[PDB]
Amino acid sequence: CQDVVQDVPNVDVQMLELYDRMSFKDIDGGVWKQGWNIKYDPLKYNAHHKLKVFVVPHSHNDPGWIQTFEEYYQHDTKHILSNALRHLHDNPEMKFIWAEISYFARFYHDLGENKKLQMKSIVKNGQLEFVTGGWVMPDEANSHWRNVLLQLTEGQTWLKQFMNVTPTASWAIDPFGHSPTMPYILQKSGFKNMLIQRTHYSVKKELAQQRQLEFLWRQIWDNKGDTALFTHMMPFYSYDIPHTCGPDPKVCCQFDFKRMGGLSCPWKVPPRTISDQNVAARSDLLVDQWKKKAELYRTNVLLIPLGDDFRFKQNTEWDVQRVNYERLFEHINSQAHFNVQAQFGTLQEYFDAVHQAERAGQAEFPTLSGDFFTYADRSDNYWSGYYTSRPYHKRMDRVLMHYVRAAEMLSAWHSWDGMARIEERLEQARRELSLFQHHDGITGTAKTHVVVDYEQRMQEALKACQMVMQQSVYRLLTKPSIYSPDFSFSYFTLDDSRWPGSGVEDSRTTIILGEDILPSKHVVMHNTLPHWREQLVDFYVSSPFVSVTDLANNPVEAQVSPVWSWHHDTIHPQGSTTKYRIIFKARVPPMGLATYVLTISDSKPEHTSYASNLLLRNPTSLPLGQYPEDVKFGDPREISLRVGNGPTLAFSEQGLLKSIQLTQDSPHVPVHFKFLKYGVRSHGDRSGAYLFLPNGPASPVELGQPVVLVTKGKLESSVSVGLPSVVHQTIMRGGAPEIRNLVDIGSLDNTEIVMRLETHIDSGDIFYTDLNGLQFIKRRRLDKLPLQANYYPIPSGMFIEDANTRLTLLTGQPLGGSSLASGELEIMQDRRLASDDERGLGQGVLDNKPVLHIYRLVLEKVNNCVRPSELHPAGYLTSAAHKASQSLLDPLDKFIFAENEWIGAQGQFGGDHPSAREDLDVSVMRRLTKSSAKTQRVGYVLHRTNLMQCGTPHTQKLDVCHLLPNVARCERTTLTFLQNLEHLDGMVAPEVCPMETAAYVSSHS
C-alpha cells in the first residue's frame, strides 16, 4: 500500500495551488468572450501532418427538469431514438453517441423484435456508441459516491445484458462543476477516457493557454498515478453547436443546420444550405474555426461535438445536419490546401486516435489533481446555490441510499422464490434512487411538479426497501423448522426516528402495551456495517412502565423520555399524555441482527430510569399523563449538561452551544452556534435554484426570548429551542453530540438561513470539505473571489484545525457551506428565492417544506495525530469523526414485530461474522443471481478509508468470499461487477489499501 499522508504527489496542475496563482480577471477576450483571439501558423498543416476532425453528433436528454422523465420520453426522447434507429440504419457513415440509459431502456423494451435486432446492429457495427452508460448523467457535487456507483452499475448492467457492450469513455457535458470522485470510480470500472465541460471560465482560459485541457486526472493523495484517467475538458462556454465548432460562436452558429427558421442565431447571421456555389467559402470559415480550436490541444486530432438539448428529434433535422455536413466533408477532404480529413465519428474513435498520436510520440500529456468547484459560467455567477436547493429531497437521497444498501444486504443472504418479488422491488428501488442522481434531481434545479415526481418515486422505492427488509429479517430470525412465509405479509413495520422526523410528519407507530392485551413486543435492530456496534435506539410506547430484555431475558438498562412536539402562535413545546420514548443500547453483530423485548409493568421497573424536563420561559402547567417525573419550570438561564464519560456542553439562555469541555480536567473550549440570513440583490444578478448571489455578509436572526426545553437522562439528554424558522436541538448520548434542525423557512422570500459555528481555532484561510462522502479536500478561502465562490459542496462533512484543535461537522444530507473567517464553519439550511436566475428553470424556489437536518459535532485534540504535510491537498477524518459520519449515513435499522406473537423467534443473526477494522466498510452486498441458477453469485464492494493515526490502535480479517457458505470461486471484479480482474487462488479476497475501493464476486454450488 501507498502512504497517503507523508508523501505529496507531484503533478503539473494541482488545482488548489493553481487557484492561489490565478487572478481570475473577467477581461473581454473578443469573439471568444472569456479567452483570447486564437492565432495558428497555417504552415503547421501540410499533406504529411493533417488535421483529423471527428464531428460527433449527440442529444442531451435530461431525465427530468422542465418536464418529468415520462413527459420528456413521450414529447421528445422516444422520437429522438426512433429517428436515430431509422436514420443510422439507412446512413452507414452517420454516427451518434448516447449517455442516459434510463431513457434508452424505457425505449428499447417497447420495441418489436425486428427493431431490437436493427438496434443491436447499429450498436454492433459502432454507429450508435454508448458514452458512460450510467442510468443518468449524475450531479457530481451533492451525490454520494455509492449512489454514483449505483447509477453507473445499473446502466452498465443493462447495457451488458441487452446490448453486450460496456463503455470505456465517459461523457459529462452538463453537471455544474466536476468531482475527481468520477475518474476514481470510472478507472476502477474499466474506463480509459472521460470528458467534462462545466468548469470555471477562468480555469478554461488558464489551462487553454498552456494546452492543459487534456490531462491524466489522478486522486489528490495518489503518489504512484495508478488512479490516473485521461480527461478531455472542452474549452468553451457551452456544449451547444455555437460553442463547439471553434472560438467564434457567430461563425459556429451558422453550422447548426436546425437553426433555419423556429430557432435562430442570437448573433443574427443564420445558417445557409451548403451548395457548390458557397461550399468553398463556408468550408474556409469552418476549417478556420477547427484550426483555432486545435491550437488549444496537443494532437492533430480534434473533437467537434454536434448537438444540443433534445436534438435529433425530427427526421428532417437528421437530414439537414447530415446532408450539409457531408457536402462540407466532401469539399474539405478533396481540397489539399485545407490538409484536413473530416468525418462523422464517436467519442471512443476520438480518444483511440488521440492515444495513437501519443503512442507515436506526437504529444505527452500533463498530470492533474483537484476538483472543479465552485463552477462560474460568467462574471460572479457562481453555482453554489444548488449545493442547498430543495434540501428536503437532498436529505431523502441519503435516507433512500441507506435503505437500498440495507434491503440488498438483508435479502442477499438467501435465494428467494420469484413469488417473493424481491428482485422486482430492489430493481424499482435502485432505479428510482439512480434517476434522482441526475443533475436536475438531487441538485433541486427541476420545476415543482418534477421535484414531486422525484419525491413520489423515492417514496415508492423506500416502501419497496421496507417490504424486502422485513421479509429478510423474519426469514433470518425464525427457526427453519417453523419458517413458512406469506410473501405479501408485513411481519415487521420499520421505525425511523430521523426520516421524515416526528416534527416534519407525525408518523411513528406507538407500540401499544397493556397487562391484558399485549404485555410484550419483540423489536429487532439491523447493523449494515461489518463491525460490532452498540447504539442507543428508541421506540414510541403507550406507557412509561416498560422494561427491556434481550430474548435470553437478560435485563437491559433503559431510559423513558416524554414525547415533545413544537407549536406556533410564540413557538412552544407540548407533551403527549398518551405515548413515551423508551431508549436503550442495542448491541448488534457485524452485518447482523439483535432481538430485544419491550415488557409493561404496573409501576417503575428496576432497570428503567426517567428523564427530568426543565421548560425555560412566564410559565403555564404541562401534564404528561403517567410520566412519573413532573415538568420543572423557570426563567431563561445558562445550562451545562453531561452524559456518561463524554463531553460537557454549556448552552446560552436561548439554548445554543457556547462551549464544549472534552474531559474533566481540560478547558471549556468556546464553540458558539448562531443562525444568520443572506438576502438577494435588489439591482444586479438575482440568486435562484442554481446561483448564490448574496447582498453582502449574513446578518444575525432576531431570536427574541425563545422557549428552551431541557430533557436530562442517564442515557440521553437534549436542549431544544423554537427559533424563528428552526427548532434547534442538541442531543447528548456520551460522545460527539447530534444536532437536529427542523427547518421551516415558511414564506421568508429572498432569504437563505445559514448555521455558523464560531471558535478560537487558528484555521486561517484553510478549511476542509468532502467530495461525494469519499475524500476530504483542502479549501483556501480567497478574498480575491466573491463570497459565493468560497461556498463549496458539503456532501457529508467539513472541518477546520490549527496545531492543537479540530472541529468537524458531519451532515446527514448534502448542503452548501464555507469557512468565511478563521475558526468559523457555516452550512446553509434552506433558501427561498422569488426570482429566476436565468439558467432555463423559469421559476425561483418557492416550494420549500419542513426538513429535519441531522449533524454530528466532533471537537477533538490533534496535537498527537500524524497529519499530512502542509503541502498535501487532502485531509483525513479521525476514527471518532468517521464513526460519527457512519452513525448519520448508516444507523441501525429498527423493526417492530407486527403480530401479537412470534413463534420461532431467535435472539441474534451474524454472531460469527468477522468484525473488520474500523476503516473498512462493505459499501455494497448484492446477490447477482435469481434462484433458477445452479451457480449463485454475490457481489461485494469493499471501501477502506484513511483515518488520521493518533496513537491509540480486536480485529478479524474479513474475507467476503467466505461470508456465504459453499464458495466454489472468488473473483476480484470492476466495481460494476461486470468484469473479472482475477480468479483468486486461495478463494480468499485480500484486504484493500487505505482510500482504495475493490469489488469481489463469490460463486456458490
Ligand SMILES: O=C(NCCCCCOC[C@]12C[C@H]3C[C@H](C[C@H](C3)C1)C2)[C@H]1N[C@H](CO)[C@H](O)[C@@H]1O
Ligand atoms: O443548460 C441547459 N440547457 C440549455 C439551457 C436553455 C435555457 C436558457 O434560457 C436562457 C433564458 C431564457 C429566457 C429567460 C431568461 C432570459 C432569456 C430568455 C434567456 C433565461 C442544461 N443544463 C440545465 C441544468 O438545469 C439542464 O439540465 C439542461 O440540460
Ligand SMILES: [Zn+2]
Ligand atoms: Zn442537463
